């Protein structure tokens, strides 16, 4: 079984540099080329460039060269990629894959789990949980606003999880160099405010956990 494990995710100040790992197993590491494709939420997979482990020979895609440097370690059979003078433009998930020949031209037949890169100057900082309640008929929707946190991720559940269905936890979005997310739970009108309906947001990095109760009025 051919495998290729990449490095854990990374957090790095722009202007800086990083070297991520891609370790092969289950085959002659020197016999096939390694590629690196980049993927930014704005869809599409870019082609960084290729490296043949045996000759150390490399081939870049002009748009990535210079900032990028592809090196190997034929001893521990592990490929590397070093991105320099980073920017917010190259915060993405980077994949490494195996190249095979087959008549006429190469294709990538095996990828990695990829490594996520995030380029920010922010530091661990707790969120601010804000209760969303209606204003002063069968079903009623409430919400909870998690704003001003860094870094990801955040875990939101309702009533410690007892409200599964009818919930919606939207992806985060980048506020002023800090994250913000919202979640909505829908419950029959009989449940609220008759009973307690609460949001539990957990922000690990800062070892936080806040229960915010949704009370009527504003």
């Amino acid at each position: 079984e051919v495998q290729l494990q990449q490095s854990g995710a990374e957090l790095v100040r722009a202007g800086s540099s990083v070297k991520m790992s891609c370790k092969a197993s289950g085959y002659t590491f020197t016999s096939y080329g390694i590629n690196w494709v980049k993927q930014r939420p704005g869809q599409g997979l870019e082609w960084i460039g290729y490296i043949n482990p045996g000759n150390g020979y490399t081939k870049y895609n002009e748009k990535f060269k210079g900032k990028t440097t592809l090196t190997v370690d034929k001893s521990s059979s592990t490929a590397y990629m070093q991105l320099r003078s980073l920017t917010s433009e190259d915060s993405a998930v980077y994949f490494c894959a195996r190249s095979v020949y087959y008549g006429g031209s190469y294709y990538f037949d095996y990828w990695g789990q990829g490594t996520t890169l995030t380029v920010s100057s922010a530091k661990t900082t707790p969120p601010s949980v804000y209760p969303l309640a209606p204003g002063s008929n069968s079903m009623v929707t409430l919400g909870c606003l998690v704003k001003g946190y860094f870094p990801e991720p955040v875990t939101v559940t309702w009533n410690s999880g007892s409200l599964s269905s009818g919930v919606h936890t939207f992806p985060a979005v980048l506020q002023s160099d800090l994250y913000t997310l919202s979640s909505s739970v829908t419950v029959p009108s009989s449940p609220r405010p008759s009973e307690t309906v609460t949001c539990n947001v957990a922000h690990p990095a800062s070892s936080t956990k806040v229960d915010k109760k949704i009370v009527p009025r504003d």
């Binding site: 599409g44 870019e46 998930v93 087959y102 031209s105 919400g143 606003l145 919202s182």
Partner: protein, 214 residues
């Protein structure tokens, strides 16, 4: 270099259907196209290679053809696990280019969002901040346009939206919309409106409130 165009970002279908995604080359690839499948959890696999036709360990429902500029992957009989994003890639001329990708999605009856507004919370206002939030939950298809109104007009600044992938139990999309102001700005105006426009009707779903009425 060699552009790669997949005319369709999102493709709908039902399980049991014969699904065809397409991909067009700015020039002649002389049959050097490959197909990749990326599942939501981010992992990518290789389904087909060399002008389509070639497999790898992938099930028989996966087929593939084309030549020159046009090429396409066909999944004769759609199965839940096949719901993923498919990219094509010309391995003819350097550099190696991909296709925007075609995400499949399950077909559902049209639904129409459930629009809800929410004024800033006291806990926030005392911080000096003020965010009005708006949820447009469980609607289909996935195209929707939201429009904010402060005292009958404008408002584009401060508006940040979020969208959820398709649901797994039902197949509806949802959208979060937040308009952030300053307690002062917020307090200078009365009515705030959140207008959801969906193909499910011509008339925008309008939900709003007036600070004076709070």
């Amino acid at each position: 270099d060699i552009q790669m165009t997949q005319t369709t970002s999102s493709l709908s279908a039902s399980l049991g259907d014969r699904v065809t995604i397409s991909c067009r080359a700015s020039q002649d690839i002389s049959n050097y196209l490959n197909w990749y499948q990326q599942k939501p959890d981010g992992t990518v696999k290789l389904l087909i290679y060399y002008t389509s036709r070639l497999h790898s360990g992938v099930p028989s429902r996966f087929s593939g053809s084309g030549s020159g500029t046009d090429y396409s992957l066909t999944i004769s009989n759609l199965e839940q696990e096949d719901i993923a994003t498919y990219f094509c890639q010309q391995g003819n001329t350097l550099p190696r280019t991909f296709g925007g990708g075609t995400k499949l999605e399950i077909k559902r009856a049209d639904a129409a969002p459930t629009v809800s507004i929410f004024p800033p919370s006291s806990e926030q206002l005392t911080s000096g901040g003020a965010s009005v939030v708006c949820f447009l939950n469980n609607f289909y298809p996935k195209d929707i346009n939201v429009k904010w109104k402060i005292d009958g007009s404008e408002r584009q600044n401060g508006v940040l939206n979020s969208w959820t992938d398709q649901d797994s139990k039902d197949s509806t999309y949802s959208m979060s919309s937040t308009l952030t102001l300053t307690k002062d700005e917020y307090e200078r105006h009365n009515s705030y409106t959140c207008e959801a426009t969906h193909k499910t009707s011509t008339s925008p779903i309008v939900k709003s409130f007036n600070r004076n009425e709070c």
